[PDB]
């Protein structure tokens, strides 16, 4: 088959700013399995009908995984804007594929508080589609050069998702996997059973 277990059943997911990227090709990928992820979850599909994904063929398939806030998952869509969309992960307008997101209360929560999930906060410019930024140099908000000190008008750009089970649904961790299908002049190999 096709290695979805390594992408959908991993112990931990990468932070939203340093999101992962998995290359999937030359496999028999059965997308009907992913309907049992949770009793209720998001399965928005852009440009392709999910009911006919089990017979189409694609040259390559990409998988991107991260963890974001519960009420902030609506920003992962073409033509959207916000905090994740224009600082961490930008989806192109001409996007084809599907996005999958399900609640992860029991796996990414701590009573003390989880601090391993970070999201970038300050940037001078937004992000082009499918572009990463892992730089952690101190951000400058004013004019005078702060040359590496956390005063004011000069702050650390990365904050933390202080996850905790006592939070409301809007602040609960949500694991997101974005499949990015495409076809080229090369032969297609990723076909359903």
């Amino acid at each position: 088959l096709c290695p979805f277990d390594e992408v959908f059943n991993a112990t931990r997911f990468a932070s939203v700013y340093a999101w992962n990227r998995k290359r999937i090709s030359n496999c028999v990928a059965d997308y009907s399995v992913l309907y049992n992820l949770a009793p209720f979850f998001t399965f928005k599909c852009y440009g392709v009908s999910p009911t006919k994904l089990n017979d189409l063929c694609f040259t390559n398939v990409y998988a991107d995984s991260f963890v974001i806030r519960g009420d902030e998952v609506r920003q992962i869509a073409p033509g959207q804007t916000g905090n994740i969309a224009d600082y961490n992960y930008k989806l192109p307008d001409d996007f084809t594929g599907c996005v999958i997101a399900w609640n992860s209360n029991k796996l990414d929560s701590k009573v003390s508080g989880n601090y391993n999930y970070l999201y970038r906060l300050f940037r001078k410019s937004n992000l082009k589609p499918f572009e990463r930024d892992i730089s952690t140099e101190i951000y400058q908000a004013g004019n005078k050069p702060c040359n590496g000190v956390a005063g004011f008008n000069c702050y650390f750009p990365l904050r933390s998702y202080s996850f905790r089970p006592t939070y409301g649904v809007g602040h609960q961790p949500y694991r997101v996997v974005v499949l990015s299908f495409e076809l080229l002049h090369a032969p297609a190999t990723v076909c359903g059973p």
Partner: antibody
Amino acid sequence: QMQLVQSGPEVKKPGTSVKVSCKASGFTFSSSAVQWVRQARGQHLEWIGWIVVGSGNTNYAQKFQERVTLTRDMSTRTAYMELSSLRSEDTAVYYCAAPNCNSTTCHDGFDIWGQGTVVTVSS
Amino acid sequence: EIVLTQSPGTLSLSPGERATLSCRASQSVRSSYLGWYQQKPGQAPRLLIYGASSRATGIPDRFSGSGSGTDFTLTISRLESEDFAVYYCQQYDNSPWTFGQGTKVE
């Protein structure tokens, strides 16, 4: 027009708690910061602390760090300061001051200021 | 952790002339993180001198900073009747921020 409109004078009793807020409008408040200072009538100013609006990081003075808290709400673009363990020597005017911003480059220093609230602690 | 000694406590000059304010610090402070504030009796202070030499918007030209290494100063190059008030100076550095005692001009 950039402005800081602050709450009204309040009078409380020793051992109680006080709550003061000032509303910001007219400038890019998503990248600003606010500090609180207190001044009794005819006395010099004293620094309490300051908070970042988009990060939540706080910094308190050494003397008051056990009896001050700073909270903000992005939806209502408001800064909240609470002082506990009231005493007779806490009658002073409290101010909230922020820098200016144009959503691209923020002003260097605390330029815009509020009106100030007079708080009395008696019994 | 940061001390800014101020003298003199009181000042006595008449308008049309030039006044001298002085905030002397006890240690090394960078000129990019200090300001100077003025309030009319009972009013909230306004920002005048940030960057140790640079005015703010609306600052009258009669003021012009000095901005030494660790001993800042601001000479009032011209007085108007408005400039009679109390003045305070603050340090913005990493240490807990502090204020001066306050200079009175008559």
